[PDB]
Amino acid sequence: FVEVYCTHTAACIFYYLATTLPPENEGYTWIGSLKLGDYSYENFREIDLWKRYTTALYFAIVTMATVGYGDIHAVNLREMIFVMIYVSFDMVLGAYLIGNITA
Amino acid sequence: IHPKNRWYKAWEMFILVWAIYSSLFTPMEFGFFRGLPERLFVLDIVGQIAFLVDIVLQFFVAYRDTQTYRTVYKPTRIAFRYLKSHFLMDFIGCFPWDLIYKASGKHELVRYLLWIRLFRVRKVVEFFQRLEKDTRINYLFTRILKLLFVEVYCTHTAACIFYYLATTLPPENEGYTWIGSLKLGDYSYENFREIDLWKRYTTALYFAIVTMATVGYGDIHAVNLREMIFVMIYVSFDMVLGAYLIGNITALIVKGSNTERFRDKMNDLISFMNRKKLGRDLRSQITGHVRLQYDSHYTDTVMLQDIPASIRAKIAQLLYLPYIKKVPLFKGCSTEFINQIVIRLHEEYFLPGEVITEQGNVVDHLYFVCEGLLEALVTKTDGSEESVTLLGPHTSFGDISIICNISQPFTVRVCELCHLLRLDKQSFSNILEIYFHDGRTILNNIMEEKESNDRIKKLESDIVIHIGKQEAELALKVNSAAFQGDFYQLKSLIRSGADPNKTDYDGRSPLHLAACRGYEDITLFLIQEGVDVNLKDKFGHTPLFEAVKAGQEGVIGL
Amino acid sequence: LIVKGSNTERFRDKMNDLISFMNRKKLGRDLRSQITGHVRLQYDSHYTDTVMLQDIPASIRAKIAQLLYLPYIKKVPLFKGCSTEFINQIVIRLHEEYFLPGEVITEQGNVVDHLYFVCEGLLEALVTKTDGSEESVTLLGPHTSFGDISIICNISQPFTVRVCELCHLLRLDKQSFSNILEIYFHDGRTILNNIMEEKESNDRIKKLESDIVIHIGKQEAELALKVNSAAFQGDFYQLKSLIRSGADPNKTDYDGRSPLHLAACRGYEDITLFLIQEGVDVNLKDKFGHTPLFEAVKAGQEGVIGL
Numbered sequence: 001f002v003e004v005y006c007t008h009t010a011a012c013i014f015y016y017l018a019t020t021l022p023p024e025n026e027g028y029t030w031i032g033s034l035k036l037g038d039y040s041y042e043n044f045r046e047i048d049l050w051k052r053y054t055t056a057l058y059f060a061i062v063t064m065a066t067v068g069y070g071d072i073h074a075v076n077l078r079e080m081i082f083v084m085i086y087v088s089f090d091m092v093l094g095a096y097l098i099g100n101i102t103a
Numbered sequence: 104i105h106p107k108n109r110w111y112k113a114w115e116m117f118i119l120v121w122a123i124y125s126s127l128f129t130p131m132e133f134g135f136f137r138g139l140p141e142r143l144f145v146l147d148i149v150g151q152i153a154f155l156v157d158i159v160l161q162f163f164v165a166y167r168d169t170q171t172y173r174t175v176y177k178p179t180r181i182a183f184r185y186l187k188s189h190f191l192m193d194f195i196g197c198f199p200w201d202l203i204y205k206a207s208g209k210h211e212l213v214r215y216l217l218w219i220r221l222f223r224v225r226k227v228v229e230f231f232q233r234l235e236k237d238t239r240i241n242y243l244f245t246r247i248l249k250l251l252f253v254e255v256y257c258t259h260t261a262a263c264i265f266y267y268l269a270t271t272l273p274p275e276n277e278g279y280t281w282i283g284s285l286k287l288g289d290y291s292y293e294n295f296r297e298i299d300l301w302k303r304y305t306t307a308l309y310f311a312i313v314t315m316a317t318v319g320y321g322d323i324h325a326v327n328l329r330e331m332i333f334v335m336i337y338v339s340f341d342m343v344l345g346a347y348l349i350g351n352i353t354a355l356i357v358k359g360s361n362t363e364r365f366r367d368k369m370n371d372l373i374s375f376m377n378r379k380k381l382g383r384d385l386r387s388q389i390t391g392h393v394r395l396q397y398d399s400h401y402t403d404t405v406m407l408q409d410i411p412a413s414i415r416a417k418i419a420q421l422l423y424l425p426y427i428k429k430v431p432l433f434k435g436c437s438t439e440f441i442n443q444i445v446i447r448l449h450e451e452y453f454l455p456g457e458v459i460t461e462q463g464n465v466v467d468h469l470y471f472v473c474e475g476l477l478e479a480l481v482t483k484t485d486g487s488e489e490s491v492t493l494l495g496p497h498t499s500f501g502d503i504s505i506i507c508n509i510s511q512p513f514t515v516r517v518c519e520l521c522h523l524l525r526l527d528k529q530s531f532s533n534i535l536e537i538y539f540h541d542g543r544t545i546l547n548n549i550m551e552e553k554e555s556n557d558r559i560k561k562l563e564s565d566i567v568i569h570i571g572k573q574e575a576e577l578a579l580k581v582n583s584a585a586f587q588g589d590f591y592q593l594k595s596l597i598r599s600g601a602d603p604n605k606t607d608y609d610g611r612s613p614l615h616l617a618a619c620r621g622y623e624d625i626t627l628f629l630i631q632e633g634v635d636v637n638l639k640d641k642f643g644h645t646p647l648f649e650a651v652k653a654g655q656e657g658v659i660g661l
Numbered sequence: 662l663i664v665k666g667s668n669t670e671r672f673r674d675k676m677n678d679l680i681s682f683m684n685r686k687k688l689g690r691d692l693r694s695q696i697t698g699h700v701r702l703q704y705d706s707h708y709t710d711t712v713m714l715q716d717i718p719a720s721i722r723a724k725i726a727q728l729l730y731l732p733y734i735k736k737v738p739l740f741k742g743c744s745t746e747f748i749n750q751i752v753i754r755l756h757e758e759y760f761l762p763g764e765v766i767t768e769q770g771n772v773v774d775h776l777y778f779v780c781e782g783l784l785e786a787l788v789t790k791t792d793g794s795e796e797s798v799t800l801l802g803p804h805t806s807f808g809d810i811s812i813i814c815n816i817s818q819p820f821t822v823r824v825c826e827l828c829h830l831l832r833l834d835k836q837s838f839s840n841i842l843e844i845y846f847h848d849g850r851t852i853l854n855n856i857m858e859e860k861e862s863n864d865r866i867k868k869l870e871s872d873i874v875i876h877i878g879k880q881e882a883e884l885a886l887k888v889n890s891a892a893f894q895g896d897f898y899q900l901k902s903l904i905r906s907g908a909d910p911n912k913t914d915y916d917g918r919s920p921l922h923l924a925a926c927r928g929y930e931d932i933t934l935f936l937i938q939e940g941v942d943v944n945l946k947d948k949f950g951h952t953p954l955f956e957a958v959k960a961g962q963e964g965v966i967g968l
Contacts, residue, residue, distance in 0.1 A: 027289040063318055070321020075288030080305055087316040091345075092251070099353040171827065172702075173762055238680045242673040347663075354663040358674075405679040408711075409704075412775065413766065414696060418688065443772065529836075533772060537817065572894070579890055583882045586915040608893050608923070609916060616915070619948070641926075642949070 003064075003093055010086050011060035015052060017079035018044065030075045031055075064090055105165055105176070114160065115230070121153050122226045129220045130260055132201075134267030135300050135307075138209060139201045151199045154223075158193050162186065189225070196220040224256070243355035250348050254315065257344070261337045262311035266303055268329050269295060281326040282306065314338050317345070365397060392454050395520075402450050416446035423448055426473050426524070429497045432548045436541035443534050449525035453517045462514040466504040468525050473497055475521025479558060481513040489513075491558045502549075503558075505531065507565035513558070539577075540599050546570060578605040585616050585625055593628065603632045610640035618650035623657035630661065672705055696764075703759035710757075723753040730755050730831070733780040739806035739859065740778070743851040747841070754837045758830050766830070767808065769819040774835045778806045782828020786865055789819050799865040800825065810856055810866060812838060814876050820865075846907050885912040892920035895929045910939045917947045925953040928962030937968065 018031045023045075026032040031044040031052075041047050059072040063083060074083045104111055128150075132139055139147065165181055167174040175181065196219045204213045231252075235245045269282045274296070277283030282295040282303065292298055292306070306323070313320050314337060325334045359367070369390070376386055406415055423445045427433055433441060453459075453475075460466060462483040472494050479500065481489035491513060494500050504511055505528055517523075535542045549566055552559050559566070581601050584592045597603070606612040614634055617625040630636070637645055650658040683693070714722055730752040734740065742748050757780075760766075766777060769789040784801030801807055801822065811818035812835060842849045860866045860873055888908050891900035900920070904910055913919055921941045924932040943953050957965040 030288075033288060063320075066316060066318045068313075068318035068320040070319065073287065073320070073322045074309070075290075077302065077305055080309060084309060084312050087312065087318065091316050091348075095349050095352045098349055099356050102353045103357045173827075238673075238676050241677070242670060350663045354666070357664055401678075401682060405682060409675070409679055410697070411700065413768065414693070414700065416768075417693065418686070421688070422686070439770065446771075530772075530774075537772060576887075576890060579886050580883070583886055583915060587878065587882065608890070609918065611916060619916075 003097065006089075006093070007061045007064050008057065010064075011053070011056040014060060014079060014082065015056045017082055018076075020078055021076065028076055030073060030079070033075065034072065036071055060086075063087055064094075066090075066094070104160060104163060106167075106174070115226075118153075118157055119227055119230050121150055121157075122223050125150050125154075125220060126224050126227065126256070127259070129218070130263030133214065133217060134263040134265075134270070135304055137270070138204065144201055147201060148199055151197060154193070154197055158190060158197060161190055161193070192219075192222055196222060241355070243351060243358075247348070247351045247355065250344070250351060254344055254348070257340070258311045258315050259308060261333075262304075262308040264333065265310060265330070266295070266307045268333060269327065272327065272329065279327060281323070281330050284326060285323050287323070311337070315341050315345070317341075361397065361401075365394065368393060388454070388456075391520075395452055395454060399450065399452050406450070412446075419446050419448055423524075426497065427471075430471060430499055431552070432499050432502065432545055435548055436544040437538065440534065440538045440541040443538075444526070444531075447526060447530050451523035451525050453521050453523055455517065455519045458514060458516045459523075460501075460511055460515060462511050465510045466501055466528070468501070468527055469499070469505055469531050470501045470515075470526075471497070471499045471524040472517075473522045473524055475517070475519055477515065477521055478518045479513055479515050481561075483514060491561065492556055503562045503565065506535075506546075507562070507569050509562070509565055512562060543573075543600065546573070574602075574605060575608070577601060579607050582607050582611060582613060582616050585613050585622075586620060588622065588625075590624055590628070593625065597632065603629050603634045606638070608641075610638075610642075610644075612638045612646070614638060614646050615640060615644070615649060618646040618658050619653055621650075621653040621655035621658050623655065623661060626658050626661050668705070668708060671708075672701075676701065699761040699764070703761070706759065707757075726752045726755065730757075733804060733831075734778065736804040737778060737780075737806055738804075739855070740809055740852060741855060742848050743855070744848060747845050747848045750841055750844075751833070751838075754833070754841075756832045758832050760824050760828050760830065762824055762826075764824050766822045766824075767818070767820065769821050770817045773808050773811055773818055776806075776808050776812065776831075776833035776835065776838055777822075778809075778831040778833070779803055780829050780831055782824065782830070783826035784828065785823050785825050787821050787823070788868070789821070795821065798868045799863065807865075809838075809852075810859075810869065810873075813853065813856060814869070814872060815880075816869075816872055816876070843906065849907075881912070882915070884908045885914050888912075889914050889918065889920045889923050892923040892929075892932055893927060895924075895927060895932060897931055897935070900932065901935060904939065910936055910941050913945070917945070918951070919945050919953075921945070921953050922947065922951060922956060925957040925962075925965050926960050928957070928960050928965055930962075930964045930968070933965050933968060 015031075018029050021029050026042055026044075032042040034041070041051075044052060055072070062069055062072075063086065074080045163178055163181065164185055165174060165176040166185060195216075200213055200217055204210070204217075207213050228249075231245070231249055234240065235242065266282065269280045272280050277293065277295075280295065282292055285292055285306070287306065292303070295303055310323050313322070314334070325331045372389060372393070373386070376382070376389070410418070420442065424441075427441055427445050427448075433444070451470075459470070462481065474496050476496075477494040477500075479491050479494055481491060483489070500515060503509065546566070546569075549559065550570075553563050553566070554560055581593070581596055581603070584596065603613050606615070611619070612634065614626065614629045614636065615638060617623075617629060639645060647659070679697075680694075683697075727749055731749060734748055734751065735745075740751075760782070767773065767775075779801050781803045783803070784805075784807070785797050786799050786801055786807060787795040787797045790796060807820075807822060808818060811820075856866070857873070860870045866873070884903075885908075888900060888903055888910065891903060910920060919941065921933065921936050921943070922945070924936060946952070954966065
């Protein structure tokens with residue numbers, strides 16, 4: 001449960017980090033530059049909240065799943081370090097889960 | 104300088120700060136920046152002179168040799184071994200090579216040899232070896248901390264190596280280089296060299312961590328074949344390191360805590376208890392008993408094997424001195440006897456409803472109910488509903504069964520949670536026979552609670568016969584001591600309370616024996632003691648007869 | 662591999678456990694934290710010994726101890742025993758210990774239950790005094806023995822021993838020594854002769870020479886007296902245990918009376934018969950010159966006279 005909550009908060013803070021930059025240089029931040037499957041949602045603010053939540057959460061537990069499709073990238077420098085920290089903490093936590101189940 | 108010093112300790116903290124700074128710094132000069140700025144070259148020479156001061160202190164450390172287990176402060180041997188161990192390696196790194204690089208026209212050989220400064224990480228790892236030595240932190244917890252630190256250090260070094268290899272390629276082929284053509288987002292890192300050092304540092308480290316956490320992420324991939332081979336080695340190393348991390352985390356928690364073991368036994372015991380469906384007080388009784396046995400076992404074993412007799416003696420003294428002093432029977436005897444009793448004590452806890460020894464069995468330990476209330480009963484296999492004075496806290500019991508050598512004249516049972524003291528027969532008997540004065544004192548105490556304690560009054564016949572035998576043997580002892588002079592010993596036993604009036608079995612009174620031997624000093628000492636002069640032996644011989652028989656005029660005159 | 666662990670892991674784990682327990686006992690951090698630490702390191706070597714000794718069927722360990730422990734004691738002039746069959750038993754019950762500097766083994770004036778032989782290392786032995794200042798009567802050395810003389814004397818041994826160098830000592834329980842002595846009384850006589858030789862030879866035993874002489878003078882007195890008393894009361898178990906402890910039935914009391922005389926005057930039959938089995942003499946003359954027959958017919962017991 002604590003792991004899942006950590007993932008959710010990671011997704012939320014990640015979307016906020018995307019929001020940090022002004023409307024200009026929308027391409028420079030990760031959102032608005034994906035253009036996956038012809039959706040090309042450049043203007044994230046215009047898009048309804050639910051889809052944005054889905055996309056951010058997907059990336060958060062895909063990094064969590066230690067799989068990494070690579071559709072979404074931490075392109076900007078500002079949030080770039082955030083994925084670093086999040087994945088490291090995730091490594092420790094996943095290892096702890098493996099240890100607990102092994103016990 | 105000496106290792107056990109405050110200033111020494113304050114020195115190594117600065118040493119390790121400088122050490123981690125230089126350890127991280129070495130990749131910073133090797134990659135992300137060709138050459139060095141004069142700005143940081145100053146910090147470089149500052150760190151190098153700090154390392155020189157460190158190596159000067161390294162010259163004289165007076166470390167303790169492991170084989171000796173005793174510190175040696177002689178300079179020459181400390182030099183001969185410790186300098187060879189570390190100073191030789193340190194010396195190469197100590198020389199600042201940025202100047203040589205500039206003098207040699209930034210020759211690649213100098214940069215390759217610059218890696219020697221990385222060797223100082225040994226001081227950092229030695230610091231954590233000392234951290235591990237501290238008892239407070241968990242061993243496996245310390246180990247996992249070490250693994251995390253080492254993993255981070257290795258990953259950062261790989262990230263720096265990635266850019267150094269990229270810059271090693273000629274500037275013309277920017278596209279073929281990975282950083283030249285990675286194009287993250289709308290922005291393109293077309294020129295790695297002109298973009299800020301940090302902008303490149305962030306991207307290179309991100310690539311290394313992506314592999315370390317095993318999430319591929321697509322995104323950046325090695326483009327250069329030179330880049331390709333390095334990635335292979337890095338990931339191969341990282342897999343085993345992460346595997347070690349998994350194993351250590353598993354092993355840290357596979358060790359069940361004392362609470363964990365206790366809860367496991369609670370689980371299976373309540374499962375069985377529910378099978379029977381008895382419930383009620385019984386569940387509580389077993390639960391309390393089992394938790395108490397864990398707590399007691401914790402106490403017992405560490406005393407049994409971890410701590411030697413001399414060492415355990417001190418803690419026994421501190422823990423049990425008031426406990427033994429409070430007991431009335433032990434009061435009135437010399438201090439050394441009390442200490443001897445204390446330093447061969449044990450620990451016992453008990454619950455309501457348990458019998459330690461049944462009536463008629465041979466007693467094997469001496470007990471004192473320090474805490475709680477206990478019921479002593481004369482209930483036996485043949486007969487029931489027989490009870491005697493309840494034993495309160497700080498009351499000894501079983502002393503009558505041991506001193507009088509009677510095998511448990513009653514059944515002793517505990518009635519609630521009590522704290523009990525256990526002590527063996529052999530050591531107690533030896534202590535008693537060594538210290539007879541304390542033995543009489545205690546027996547006089549036994550006389551004191553006589554006709555005041557029902558249990559003692561019931562068994563008082565055994566104590567009476569025991570004191571009769573003790574007085575008989577004491578009379579024999581004083582007669583023997585008077586035989587071989589021992590004027591001081593006779594005086595001491597008089598101070599000990601020995602009655603000179605008592606005679607031996609032969610009727611040989613101390614005056615009789617003094618006359619027979621002819622020691623007039625003993626004769627006058629017994630005279631001023633107050634014993635009647637006219638006495639008879641088994642055959643009725645008066646001391647005048649033996650005084651004449653021996654032939655000394657002094658005893659006859661007295 | 663990690664879960665299997667190492668002896669170091671158990672070492673640290675037990676460190677944590679009893680350190681936590683001592684902290685819950687609120688013991689002083691300066692007083693014993695180091696001592697526990699010091700002894701703890703030496704225990705690391707001996708845990709293997711403990712595991713083997715519990716595991717082994719006790720014969721092979723006897724052989725290995727014979728290989729190693731026997732030479733050390735043979736080197737020691739003290740406790741030679743003047744025979745080799747007797748010493749190997751001592752080896753098979755013998756245990757070993759390491760130490761750290763500035764450590765006190767035995768406190769003054771305590772009943773000793775552990776017998777220490779300095780197979781290796783240097784020791785200093787000092788005696789308490791009324792002033793309390795320590796006086797080092799002797800400096801002990803490798804392949805020596807201390808505290809055995811105390812058991813021979815039965816004295817409280819008011820001696821403090823402090824290590825002066827790296828040392829290996831052997832720890833022996835008093836009871837095992839008593840048992841081996843009762844098995845071999847003659848070897849006890851031989852070691853008594855060896856001890857009376859050292860009393861001239863060595864300073865510490867020369868310091869205790871007054872005690873050695875007095876108690877040897879004393880010890881005989883109780884032995885003859887005690888058997889006579891136990892013959893007087895007639896308790897057969899105690900007297901026979903004492904007489905099989907090494908007491909001489911022919912030894913006489915201060916008046917010269919024998920346990921046979923007291924048994925006859927009391928008139929008990931089984932004591933007299935047992936003493937007959939012991940080859941007790943009858944021609945013995947007391948200060949009054951009494952013979953067992955005389956008091957046997959004085960008291961009036963037919964069985965003793967008939968025998």
